Structure 1
Amino acid sequence: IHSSVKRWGNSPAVRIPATLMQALNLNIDDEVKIDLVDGKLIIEPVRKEPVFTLAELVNDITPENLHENIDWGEP
């Protein structure tokens, strides 16, 4: 599969077809790791992400910081 490195704003970047991105389980706005070895630039998904528990978040909810449900309105 042939692509290219081009200038996107201030940075070099490489285009990938949506079908390939989709075939590799990546999405727009995903973080990736690019560890380089030998002569092939390497790019992979991140495995580590922030983790929270139900208890830690719910216990920090208070009557004072609770938000009402957003009124989305109608079209």
Structure 2
Amino acid sequence: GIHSSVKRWGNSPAVRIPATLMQALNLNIDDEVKIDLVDGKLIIEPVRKE
């Protein structure tokens, strides 16, 4: 895919996610994504607060 790079956000790094893709997963700003360690990779799953 796109060769995007992870830059530093003030102090801690942040994975810049294309706003276009955010709409595909149906999530928005302030969303609580659950970072779980699976297969030695970062599984980012958006957890809705209903």
TM-score class, shorter-chain normalisation, is 0.7 to 0.9
Query: After superposition, what is the alpha-carbon deviation per residue over 1:28-63, rounded to whole angstroms, capped at 9, x for unaligned?
Result: 111110001113211011245xxxxxxxxxxxxxxx
- Considering Cα pairs closer than 8 Å and 6+ residues apart, tell me whether 1 or 2 has the greater RCO: 2
For structure 1, which runs of at least 5 residues remain unmatched after alignment? 49-75
CA distance in 1, matches of 2:46, 2:18: 17
What is the SS of the residue equivalent to 2:22? Answer: helix
For structure 2, which runs of at least 5 residues remain unmatched after alignment? none
Q: Is the 8 A contact 1:7 1:13 kept in 2?
A: yes
TM-score by length of 1: 0.54
1:44 to 1:17, Cα distance in 2 relative to 1, 3 A: same
Greater strand fraction, Structure 1 or Structure 2: 2
Identity %: 100
What is the SS of the residue equivalent to 1:19? Answer: helix
Question: Quick check: which has more Rg, 1 or 2?
Answer: 1
Q: Give the total of aligned pairs.
A: 48
Give the CA RMSD over aligned residues.
1.6
CA distance in 1, matches of 2:3, 2:36: 20
> Segments of 4+ in structure 1 off by > 6 A?
none
